[PDB]
Amino acid sequence: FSCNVDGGSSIGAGTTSVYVNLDPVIQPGQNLVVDLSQHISCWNDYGGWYDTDHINLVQGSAFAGSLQSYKGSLYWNNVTYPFPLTTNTNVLDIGDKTPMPLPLKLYITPVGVVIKAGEVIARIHMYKIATLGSGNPRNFTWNIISNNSVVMP
Numbered sequence: 001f002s003c004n005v006d007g008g009s010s011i012g013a014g015t016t017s018v019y020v021n022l023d024p025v026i027q028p029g030q031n032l033v034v035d036l037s038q039h040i041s042c043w044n045d046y047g048g049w050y051d052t053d054h055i056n057l058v059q060g061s062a063f064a065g066s067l068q069s070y071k072g073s074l075y076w077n078n079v080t081y082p083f084p085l086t087t088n089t090n091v092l093d094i095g096d097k098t099p100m101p102l103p104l105k106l107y108i109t110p111v112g113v114v115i116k117a118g119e120v121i122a123r124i125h126m127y128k129i130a131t132l133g134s135g136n137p138r139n140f141t142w143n144i145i146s147n148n149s150v151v152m153p
């Protein structure tokens with residue numbers, strides 16, 4: 001099982017930065033939408049649904065400290081959860097070689113410069129396990145980072 005960000009190099013595990021464009025100006029209590037399907041894609045390294053991969057997002061995934069007061073929601077594979085995640089999400093199953101954009105969207109409600117360019121706004125923990133043998137479990141963390149400043153007069 002592997003993933004990439006913006007069509008980049010393969011990722012087997014670990015923490016990866018995910019840069020996203022945010023609305024440069026928002027008024028309280030305006031809502032920000034972050035479509036991560038436009039950045040993160042994953043695939044089965046064998047294909048043919050031989051050793052199918054099973055992916056879910058993990059309890060504890062949340063906004064990044066400085067934004068710990070923010071309210072939000074996390075859409076994942078046909079279900080919309082409250083964010084930060086208080087439970088593990090449903091399982092998405094991957095068995096094709098062709099990259100699958102993650103069906104993943106983050107809805108943010110903030111509670112001058114609100115968010116800094118280069119600032120981690122959220123950390124999404126993703127868990128993988130396959131079908132054959134032990135399934136070779138692996139952990140991914142997607143550090144969502146803003147490409148631009150977000151202000152709020």
Ligand SMILES: CC(=O)N[C@H]1[C@H](Oc2ccccc2-c2cccc(C(=O)O)c2)O[C@H](CO)[C@H](O)[C@@H]1O
Pocket residue numbers: 001002011012013043044045046047051052053129130131135136
């Ligand atoms: C061990 C291991 O991950 N098995 C995976 C297997 O991983 C690979 C298969 C072929 C080439 C490379 C990898 C690969 C990718 C990333 C990390 C590692 C690693 O060493 O941990 C291996 O892929 C299968 C279907 O995708 C299952 O996920 C199975 O559990």
